[PDB]
With several copies, the nearest count.
Chain A
Amino acid sequence: QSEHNVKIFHNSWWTHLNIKNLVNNQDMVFNSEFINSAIIKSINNKTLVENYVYSPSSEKETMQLLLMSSSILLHLCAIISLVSISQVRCFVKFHLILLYKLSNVYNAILNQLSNKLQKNWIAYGFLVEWSSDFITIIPENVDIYIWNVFSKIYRTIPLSFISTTLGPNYQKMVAFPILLSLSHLLHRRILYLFDTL
């Protein structure tokens, strides 16, 4: 029986290539979305039956809401758990510094052109930024700006949730306080998800 060796030269030449755009006959000149249709169809067709609430009428709406909430929360939890690693934060900081210097280059060129077109070293260069806590060298202006953008985007969430869930005794009487509470808690949870990120 022979003893093998670790291959260290040109191991998988087919891996570091992007053959996709050539094989699928792009650039010369298959379709998804059967997936989500099949997923929601299976959700409706089985729905697990809430016999504990004596099989209520909505049901499929509840299961679809649970699926959307679980998917959103899984993606956000994966992102938060990824950025909770300190080396990932180092990576993010390095990419932010590079994008700032490159944005300065873009800004220099662009605004110089739109300046003359009107009506027609390591200390400064990535050491005192790479070695400093980024809470220090970041204005509170950008934090306030990002928070204002976020709160402006996610401002109609309670009313849109109420409009979706209230659209097509006790029938719409044990639902409206619960849907109101769900909309309020959902909006505060999105704000707190921004806070924990």
Chain B
Amino acid sequence: LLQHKCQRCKGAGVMTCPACLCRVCGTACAWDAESEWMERWGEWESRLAYYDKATGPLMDEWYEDVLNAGNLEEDTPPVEDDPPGPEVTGRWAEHDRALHKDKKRMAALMRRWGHPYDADANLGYQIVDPTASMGENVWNMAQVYNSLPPELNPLRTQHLADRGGGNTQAAVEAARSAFDAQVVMEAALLQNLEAAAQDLPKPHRLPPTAGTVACNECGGAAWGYSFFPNTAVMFGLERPFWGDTLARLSKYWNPTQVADPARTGQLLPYGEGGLRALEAVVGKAPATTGRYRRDLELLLAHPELRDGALRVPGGWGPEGGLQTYLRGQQEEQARMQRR
């Protein structure tokens, strides 16, 4: 009842930029740079794979299998005997050989990397189990540094405490602080979304961004509590009528001229300057696109990259995804002639 919003910005705290809509706008954000979207999401996905317990019971049974190597309940041996020859061609023979090398390749995987629970790649064994209690899992998460991935875990680089070295207090600490600031800002964004979902004013007044300026009257506060109760929150008269908003927007978008442009001598519309197989057949050209031109050309040049068995990490630059896979294949093909 005590919340009142600014009447100029309607509780937003930001107005559309006076110029350009620049040196009067805000200072953009970290996620407007489209060139770093896939790198940012790749690092975030790599961080989230530590916490992800979607495959939890499967990795738990794998952990039990590698702990006690004395299992039972087989009850039928799989037949599964057809890796026919190193000869012939096609896709079936290649896929079948790659499927039949599964046991030796899994042994290689378990020798090079081992179980994720034995190397702290995942969260470990049963630490966070649902249906236990909200608070036992909180205690287990607060135990050691289970809330952080090992790339930001302080108990991994303390052995390098002498002279700093690889910047365990300047690079790992900076990365951990940036990660914590990002998750705290995510919580702030979620609180703002929750307040916006129920028509309430947002609690966190964020700085203006690259298309916005601060409000003239608030400066960015956009609302506040007061002794006087809101008579719009009371009596339900908080939101305008749809027809009234339509009439306001129609009158605002349709200015009229009450002077004929012959008595006043005006021959041009308002503004400065005054006197003066594309874009009409196909229509424009994308502007945010253009950094993916090389990847599109390479995907057209090599149709084998469209194979369903191939899954590149993703990216647009020379470093990452299609170009990385093509460079790896070319390096392998060049170095197999010398070996």
Contact = CB atoms under 8 A, between A and B. Distances in A.
Contacts of B7: 38
Contact of B226 (A12, A20, A22, A36): A36
B134 A32 contact: no
B130 A9 contact: yes
Contact of A30 (B130, B185, B187, B219): B219
Nearest to A19: B188
Contact of B204 (A19, A31, A32): A19
Nearest to B191: A14
A30 B205 contact: yes
Contacts of B134: 9-10
B218 A34 contact: yes
Interface string B210-249: 0000000111111011111100000000000000000000
B184 interface: yes
Nearest to A42: B7
Contacts of A39: 4, 226, 228
Interface residues of A, number: 25
Nearest to B131: A9
A80 to B, nearest CB: 16
Contact of B221 (A15, A32, A67): A32
B190 interface: yes
Contacts of B191: 14-15, 17, 19
Contact of B228 (A17, A32, A67): A67
B205 A24 contact: yes
A71 B228 contact: yes
Nearest to A74: B229
A195 interface: no
B130 A14 contact: no
Contact of A20 (B186, B190, B194, B204): B204
A17 B229 contact: no
Interface in A59-83: 67, 71, 74-75
Given A9-B131, A12-B194, A15-B194, A32 B188 contact: no
Interface of B: 4, 6-7, 13, 130-131, 134, 184-188, 190-191, 194, 203-206, 217-222, 224-229
List 4 tightest A-B contacts by C-beta distance, closest first: A32-B224, A30-B221, A14-B190, A14-B187
23 contacts: A9-B131, A10-B134, A12-B194, A15-B191, A17-B187, A19-B191, A19-B204, A20-B203, A23-B185, A23-B206, A30-B205, A30-B221, A31-B218, A31-B219, A33-B224, A34-B221, A35-B226, A36-B226, A36-B227, A39-B4, A67-B228, A71-B228, A75-B227
Given A34-B224, A38-B7, 13 more contacts: A14-B186, A15-B194, A19-B187, A19-B188, A19-B204, A24-B204, A30-B205, A30-B220, A34-B6, A34-B221, A36-B227, A39-B226, A67-B228
